[PDB]
Amino acid sequence: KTQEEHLKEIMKHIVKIEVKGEEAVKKEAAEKLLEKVPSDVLEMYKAIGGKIYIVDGDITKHISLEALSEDKKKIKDIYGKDALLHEHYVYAKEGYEPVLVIQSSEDYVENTEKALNVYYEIGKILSRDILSKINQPYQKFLDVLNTIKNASDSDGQDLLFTNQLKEHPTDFSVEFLEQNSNEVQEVFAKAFAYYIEPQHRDVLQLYAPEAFNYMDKFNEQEINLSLEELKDQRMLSRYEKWEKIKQHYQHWSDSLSEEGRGLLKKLQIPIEPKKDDIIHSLSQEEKELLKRIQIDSSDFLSTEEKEFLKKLQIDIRDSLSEEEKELLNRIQVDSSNPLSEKEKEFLKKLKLDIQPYDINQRLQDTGGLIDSPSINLDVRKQYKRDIQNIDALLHQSIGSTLYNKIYLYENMNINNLTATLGADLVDSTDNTKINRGIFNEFKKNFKYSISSNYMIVDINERPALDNERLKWRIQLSPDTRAGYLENGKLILQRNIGLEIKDVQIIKQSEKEYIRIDAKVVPKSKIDTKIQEAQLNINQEWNKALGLPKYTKLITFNVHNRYASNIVESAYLILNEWKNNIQSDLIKKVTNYLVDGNGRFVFTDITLPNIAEQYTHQDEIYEQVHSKGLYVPESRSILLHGPSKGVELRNDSEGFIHCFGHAVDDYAGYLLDKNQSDLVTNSKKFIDIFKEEGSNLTSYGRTNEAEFFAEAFRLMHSTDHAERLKVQKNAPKTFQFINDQIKFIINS
Ligand SMILES: CNC(=O)[C@H](Cc1c[nH]c2ccccc12)NC(=O)[C@@H](CC(=O)NO)CC(C)C
Ligand SMILES: [Zn+2]
């Protein structure tokens, strides 16, 4: 009866009968007709100012449809056969003041033909009058249309298509759907009708199963999100929602201190480095070294950082002028492009000091592991104080008596999730369309997400920045804690859990975006999934490599918004790895690793924050962050997913490159089993690098190990051509490596 109530409330509100004889049997008859339509499509019609009129005799003879034009007075039935309006039993008047007219009859229980037509007209209202206001149907329903057209049995077409669509060769492109607006809306109406009229439902499932499934899933679940999105379009609706939430947090807001307000503020605007401070905290000796070191010569500083640094030299220019040029004039050419040890150390210490104070970034980088010793102790503690405090400020949950389900919105840049994919998300030709191919890949294994920092969301959806093609629709839990912001936003507590309920391409303001429907759940529920996954992937590969049953080789250090993908991609990476390297080369090397308690860490927090690396660092500034990294001391391969390595097709290439470094380790172990050195450091190799140390990837031209690793990787790619490349361009190395693989396999 939870449903029953909702009906009459709305029905007697939008539905008005006007008959002759006893209006008890006639009303209860027409009511039996509407009760079969999804409760929500009735409320969406109310929203756009629609009303339903049940009358006797000719329908054209009614107040509303009175001002109707003579021309259109010729509508076709569900089967597309003309029939004049003053002779029909239904009609849905379009326009910005929607009206629905139906003749009185109870035989609808028998005459399924009329009922099917009434629902047809209604479906027409849903697609043409309602959903169009929120750019629907779109790609999803479009896919159904194509599944239906190219399918084997062509009956599904004869059932829902018109000869207009029946003749179109190629699939229906997004553009098609745009210029053929009414056509698509038509199919929707017909599918809706057949699915709603109890008697024709089977015919739909028989000839057009995909269409049945779509309307089935739409009418049961997804219909409510449509209502929600339609409401989001309405002024009074948006401000009524914002006000209840504001009211709910009024006490909390009214008690916020100035200190509190200040904390929330810097959470929104990071503090940038003060050029002044920088210099001062240098050193009488150091300042000397910075006056002319070239920041452009570094390979560990982002241009972003470089630009800033060089602007510090320029600000030291004071006394004894002559110096200025003797330095500018004595360092540029005869000194050259190359490098310098002692001073690069200086730049690595400065990198740390010139990072902006960004609380959210810190949580994201560390996955919430705020004690990570990846930055100087002084700032680490400052971050910990502000964080602990923010956790205490956002204590009140969203649950209220003023409302039930509540959706909050977040616009996001895809690079923040997967840079490697964000490179081709947008269509290169037309920047307003989404590359369907990347879409499917991105969507692939995206089942759950994690928030380790403080998410900032909008109460009502708002337009995104140019580089934000991701639009999240999140259903909060009444348990979720948050803070209210005057500008119509909420700051959510850290360590939230998110299940991905749906992912689809949607149009808005002439551009396409990726709508992500998510539901907030306990972070423990997601973590448990990750942990069961780790257990699974280890049993599986322990068996494939012949390792003791309970060894801990593979580890998931997952804490961010693309969580599920890090886990699932790990399986795929390890596969390209075995199917591209000598099964016996793997075993000896990983066995060696396991002996040293090594690990294969797949993570989404920055590498400087993985213990497998930081616990073996002499100095903090010596840390390294990148796509992949091999650590000899811990004997582990670290792979950071979110990133995009310097032109390396995928994560696999990256993982393999690191395994290369591992080989250079074991092989180097076999030579001087009495010492700890790399076979890549051997003289016999130093020379080869002096000759072929340029015949490969620009990167390989960095140094010994790097060269060996890149060569190794190529020699194992999936594109066999790349294997030959080293063959015909780095012969010396090719052999050296293949000798190395034997010198391990056999020993
Ligand atoms: C964004 N990912 C990248 O392309 C960075 C770039 C980089 C080089 N040196 C650095 C020092 C500090 C921070 C970043 C870098 N490099 C890497 O990931 C390389 C890491 C490596 O050589 N591991 O053994 C693997 C290589 C095949 C891409
Ligand atoms: Zn390397």
GROMACS .gro file of C-alpha atoms and ligand atoms in nm, residues 628-629 657-658 661 699 705-706 709-710, ligand 2:
model
   11
  628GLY     CA    1   5.714   0.196  -1.203
  629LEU     CA    2   6.016   0.149  -0.984
  657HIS     CA    3   6.048  -0.270  -1.767
  658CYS     CA    4   6.089  -0.298  -1.390
  661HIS     CA    5   6.580  -0.409  -1.349
  699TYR     CA    6   6.481   0.708  -2.212
  705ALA     CA    7   7.058  -0.009  -1.597
  706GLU     CA    8   6.804   0.210  -1.774
  709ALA     CA    9   6.581  -0.239  -1.879
  710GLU     CA   10   6.439  -0.069  -2.188
  749ZN      ZN   11   6.426   0.209  -1.518
   0.00000   0.00000   0.00000
